[PDB]
Amino acid sequence: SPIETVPVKLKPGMDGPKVKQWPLTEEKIKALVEICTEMEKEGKISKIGPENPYNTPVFAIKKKDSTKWRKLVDFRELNKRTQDFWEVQLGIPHPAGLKKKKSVTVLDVGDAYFSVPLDEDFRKYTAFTIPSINNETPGIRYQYNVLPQGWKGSPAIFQSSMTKILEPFRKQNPDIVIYQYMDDLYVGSDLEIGQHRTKIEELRQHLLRWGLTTPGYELHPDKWTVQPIVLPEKDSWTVNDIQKLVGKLNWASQIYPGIKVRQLCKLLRGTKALTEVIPLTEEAELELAENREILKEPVHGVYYDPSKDLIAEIQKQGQGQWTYQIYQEPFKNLKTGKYARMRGAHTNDVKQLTEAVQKITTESIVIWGKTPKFKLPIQKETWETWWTEYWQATWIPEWEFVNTPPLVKLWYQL
Amino acid sequence: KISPIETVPVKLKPGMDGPKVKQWPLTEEKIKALVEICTEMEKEGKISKIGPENPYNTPVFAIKKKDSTKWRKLVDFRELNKRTQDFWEVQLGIPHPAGLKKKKSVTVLDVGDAYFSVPLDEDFRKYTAFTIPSINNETPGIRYQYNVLPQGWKGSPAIFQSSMTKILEPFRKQNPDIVIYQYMDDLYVGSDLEIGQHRTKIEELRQHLLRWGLTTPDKKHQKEPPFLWMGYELHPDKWTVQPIVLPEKDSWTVNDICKLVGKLNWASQIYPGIKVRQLCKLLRGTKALTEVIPLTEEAELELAENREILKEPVHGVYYDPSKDLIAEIQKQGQGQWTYQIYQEPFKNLKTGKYARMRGAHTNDVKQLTEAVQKITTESIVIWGKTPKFKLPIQKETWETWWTEYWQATWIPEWEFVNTPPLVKLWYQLEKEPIVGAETFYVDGAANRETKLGKAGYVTNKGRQKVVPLTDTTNQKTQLQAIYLALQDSGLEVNIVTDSQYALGIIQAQPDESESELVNQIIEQLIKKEKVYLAWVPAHKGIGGNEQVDKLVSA
DNA sequence: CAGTCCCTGTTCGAGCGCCGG
DNA sequence: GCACCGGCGCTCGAACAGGGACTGT
Ligand SMILES: Cc1cn([C@H]2C[C@H](O)[C@@H](COP(=O)(O)OP(=O)(O)OP(=O)(O)O)O2)c(=O)[nH]c1=O
Ligand SMILES: [Mg+2]
Ligand SMILES: [Mg+2]
Ligand SMILES: [Mg+2]
Ligand SMILES: [Mg+2]
């Protein structure tokens, strides 16, 4: 709806997104057609022809505590292509405070963008296409007229108005922290579990009051905490046990350079049978516990660098357990952690992977204000086929796939 | 009649001008036959005569049409296509008859002179200038530019399809129950109306299309049960493919094996059992398309086996959304799979084939899994849903696989079908080291400058063995040493290596491979009873590993 | 110890064909 | 001496990555 739009540039050297629309299920094409026919009548999107060379895929998800479908667009590409606009020109400050909070509620304030108009010279970049079941008709192309939900540039433009709406609430609640990441609003407090819930209720009202709708849940930062690398505690040690132990230690030495293995290798002199029991020597016993000591106190010299990318590797541990590590430069981890099976959901390794992905990303937003690039333990096709069945987030992070077997039953396990 | 629809605004890539390429000399038959096409279009206003103010030129030619008699004017815009702005292709795929639902009345129409009935952007008409040379080249030939959509330009299909959708948008509003499968100018219009009342909407649709410039000549399938649409023959109950003639010849060139695999693949759509892997092996080693290649023995068998599937009529039934979708998979040969999507026992919808060899070292399970995926993906494309699978694998085989594998894996709702050859895991390495089994420490090195190498083992009991190797690599030698440790051992072995690479291959439990060395290491592991494989860090003081390292150094 | 070579494994797009228009 | 666009298959080569050796000051 008309006022004054902001001139949005693309970096001279980069071209707009040109991504192919992947296949969608009937249940969700129908959903998209309805949402799009609605959104067009309202004037949010417009029909375009093939002379617009750009595309960005669309789909639909079904959020938790919702039976209504949500139109999600995979803007990942356009974001990479407009990062000077959203990171440099119009940055959104990240508070180091919500990490230190007790409870943080996330709010889907994405609805607010549909009021603000998008620059004409940019509407072209936000083009998408709905497919048709069994290719009855060619795809129906559309483009945004308003700010899009999924673009990292929408909150950037809305900052102006968002800070105004939020100021009277902040003036009387200076102790409460509000961070904005895309369609979401992270709101944290050092208050009581019950009093938090009502301040959130007041905030909802405050926004609903300023014209913005917002249709235990909430995150507990300090209830996550970094889990260490740990060595087993055997009563008696075998040849095999010592070798597996030496392996763990050898890779671990790439993280903590002070770990010595010498005396453990001294116990392994000559070709012994794998199940022969070797008792521990005086110095071997000292090196065991001394190495364990270095794995008790985490690696020093781990500083976030806001220009460098966040990287995350996940490991499938089996029986519903999944471990993760986030770093920027290898062996120098910023955060490490587990991921347990949620109560009531059916066992599907992909649901678990996607769930894990979303958790870690949320943590990464809350902690750093950025999303990580994921090194996923799954084959490309397997993921590309079922990830959208379990997705419930408004953002989508970067990912690559990796096949790497567990040589040393992953430093992370039992 | 040319369409009164608004033009799609076209631009040329920034800083580039239009084509100034000369017309090549043509055949007298073709030139004479192209003057008729151009005279017909001028009087109909489809092209326009241009004077000395148009510096552009592009060559034209003509191809014969599918049913002959009439020509097709083509323009070699390979040059303008380069200087023209990119488009976004609106055609996302080819419609499949297995996706069509059972209709009471059908009529498939084709729109004659399709592209030559849609306006071209008034501003862009200049670069679409061509030249028809005279009968014997006297003075200049007639010039001409386009006022309509040219056959051979990058922008043409996307603009036409898009222009066809805007044409059928008003008619569909007034007729929601009518299914118009539109692919270019080929409209399969199908309804649940009675034959008399159906034929009336078709005349309303015909008249609608003629108000829009789009003519439908009297070569529109009326009510003729053998409807030829999209390379198929559609009967009211069932559909089949159009006649597929596979050519028999004594000597074959590489261009022919390409043509045969492509034909065979097309026919995989509904003829179950098609195999191409051995025929496809003849395209290996690049070579010329003109060069003759001899048909090997295993490929002669396959072409004969495929010839046998083809001389039999097979049909596929249409879709019933009130009934659910079933997909079934069979193992063919090595790395080859066939599936079939049905709703009822002998009544198939579509059949298929999965033969991709992704990776150097895979297994049946891994392959069955990517087969399941290929279907799921294309099922969502045709019916908008995923099917229930009937798979040749045990619930317990699958369970041992996924719970033990390091990648995340999943196959949808499926049921075990007891149809041999079954998909199984041929071995399973031990979680813990075998007590009462000999421990084999293995390593194997190679000199990268002389291409020579050694590979061997040393055991706890005192057993030892090193072997010289000819044209090896450092990785092959470490693989050779696992092979040795497996030959010279009992039913129960314990092998300990310092190679990530090798162990990595074996941990993934391969049952096939591109490498013969790896193939026989598998053959050996299957022959065993209990095998425990483990890893150790290279240049550390691991007594056992250290001993073999020295031995393989010279 | 660091670059550097080789091996081996990937992923992408190109090229050819098939079918459709 | 020959156009376009789409989907699929199949092979090849480019580009890239990781590990183990090598070499070198
Ligand atoms: C098969 C084919 C189609 N096309 C496009 C352009 C045609 O206008 C359109 C439809 O092709 P056809 O319908 O096969 O040809 P047409 O409609 O122009 O004329 P008619 O009905 O008289 O056969 O498809 C090409 O550009 N080249 C081709 O070789
Ligand atoms: Mg036609
Ligand atoms: Mg046609
Ligand atoms: Mg060695
Ligand atoms: Mg060595």
Side-chain angles (χ1 to χ4, degrees), chain B residues 443 498 539 549:
Chain B
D443 198 322
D498 71 322
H539 311 320
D549 189 72

Side-chain angles (χ1 to χ4, degrees), chain B residues 443-446 474 478 498 539 548-550 552-553:
Chain B
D443 198 322
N474 243 306
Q478 269 146 34
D498 71 322
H539 311 320
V548 220
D549 189 72
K550 216 184 199 91
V552 298
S553 313

Side-chain angles (χ1 to χ4, degrees), chain B residues 110-114 185:
Chain B
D110 205 298
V111 172
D113 224 44
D185 65 341

